[PDB]
A paper describes a structure:
As a core component of the hnRNP complex in mammalian cells, hnRNP A2/B1 is an abundant protein and has been implicated in numerous biological processes. The B1 isoform contains an insertion of 12 amino acids (aa) at its N terminus. Both isoforms have an RNA-binding domain (RBD) composed of tandem RRMs separated by a 15-aa linker, and a C-terminal Gly-rich low complexity (LC) region that includes a prion-like domain (PrLD), an RGG box, and a PY-motif containing a M9 nuclear localization signal (PY-NLS). Here, we determined the crystal structures of the tandem RRMs of hnRNP A2/B1 in complex with various RNA substrates, revealing the molecular details of specific target RNA recognition and shedding light on the mechanism for hnRNP A2/B1 in various RNA-mediated biological functions. The two RRM domains in hnRNP A2/B1 interact with each other extensively in a fixed antiparallel orientation, and the binding surfaces of RRM1 and RRM2 align in the same plane, which forces hnRNP A2/B1 to bind two antiparallel RNA strands or a single-stranded RNA with a long connecting loop.
ITC results confirmed that the 10-nt RNA oligo 5′-A0A1G2G3A4C5U6A7G8C9-3′ (termed 10mer RNA) has a higher affinity. We successfully obtained the crystal of hnRNP A2/B1(12–195) in complex with the 10mer RNA, which was determined to 1.85 Å resolution. However, this time the RNA molecule is recognized by both RRM1 and RRM2 from two hnRNP A2/B1 molecules, of which the other one is from the asymmetric molecule. The 10mer RNA molecule adopts a single-stranded conformation accommodated into a positively charged groove comprised by the canonical RNA-binding surface of the RRM1 and RRM2 from two hnRNP A2/B1 proteins, in a 5′–3′ direction from RRM1 to RRM2. Unlike the complex structure of 8mer RNA in which only RRM1 is involved in specific recognition, the complex structure containing 10mer RNA also shows specific recognition by RRM2. Due to the higher resolution, more detailed interactions are observed in the complex structure of 10mer RNA than in the 8mer RNA complex. Unlike the 8mer RNA complex structure, the UAG motif in the 10mer RNA is specifically recognized by RRM2. The side chain of Arg185 hydrogen bonds to both the 2′-OH and O2 group of U6, and the N3 and O4 groups are hydrogen bonded to the side chain of Glu183 and Arg99, respectively. The base of A7 is also clamped by Phe115 and Met193 through hydrophobic interactions; N7 of A7 forms hydrogen bond with Arg185; N1, N6, and the phosphate group are hydrogen bonded to the main chain of Leu188, Lys186, and the side chain of Arg185, respectively. In addition to the hydrogen bond formed between phosphate group of G8 and the side chain of Arg153, the O6 of G8 base is recognized by the side chain of Lys113, and the base of G8 has another π–π stacking with Phe157.
Residue numbers in the entry: 15 to 193
Write the structure that this text describes.
RNA sequence: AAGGACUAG
């Protein structure tokens, strides 16, 4: 079995009517849930409008996310790979973006290496290898833009990736202000 | 629309 963080979705924009039974019933169409929670105010027990579901495998998670959009109790819900509590509060931790920064790729990594590595995670719209305008030389990083945010969210659960023989690193692409 | 905990031997 895989790490729990890799099996967990945050589910945003729940109806205040949605319960753990109705959330469980819905998400159980893509696999077994080992945990299901709707967050509630501790005194009023009023729903806070989000919860989490945890599948028995990451393949189940992927199967659910391949079947978006999701709706429960008449609301279109907003599932997202769960961001670990340690990460929450770091700059850009909860951003929703289609673009991924790939660093540590040095000077021999081309567009086609990023394509071949990343296209299993989703549909790629654009790849940009960054070069120094003056020297022409690759600067050791690039950006991969997918057609959806979910590939980016999935990829960045794992910080370190071997890419083209390098010890590469992935980050969600941020504007300078989100940084 | 960002975490509830049989999370005190």
């Amino acid at each position: 079995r895989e790490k729990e963080q890799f099996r967990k979705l945050f589910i945003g924009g729940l109806s205040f009517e949605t319960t753990e039974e109705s959330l469980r019933n819905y998400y159980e169409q893509w696999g077994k849930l080992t945990d299901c929670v709707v967050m509630r105010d501790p005194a009023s027990k009023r729903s806070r409008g989000f919860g989490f579901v945890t599948f028995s495998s990451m393949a189940e998670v992927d199967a659910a996310m391949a079947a978006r959009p999701h709706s429960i109790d008449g609301r279109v819900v907003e599932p997202k790979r769960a961001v670990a509590r340690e990460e929450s509060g770091k700059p850009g931790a909860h951003v929703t973006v289609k673009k991924l920064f790939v660093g540590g790729i040095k000077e021999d990594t081309e567009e086609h290496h990023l394509r071949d590595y990343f296209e299993e995670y989703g549909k790629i719209d654009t790849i940009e290898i960054i070069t120094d305008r003056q020297s022409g030389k690759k600067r050791g990083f690039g950006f991969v833009t997918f057609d959806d945010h979910d590939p980016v969210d999935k990829i960045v659960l794992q910080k370190y990736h071997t890419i083209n023989g390098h010890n590469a690193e992935v980050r969600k692409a941020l504007s300078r202000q989100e940084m």
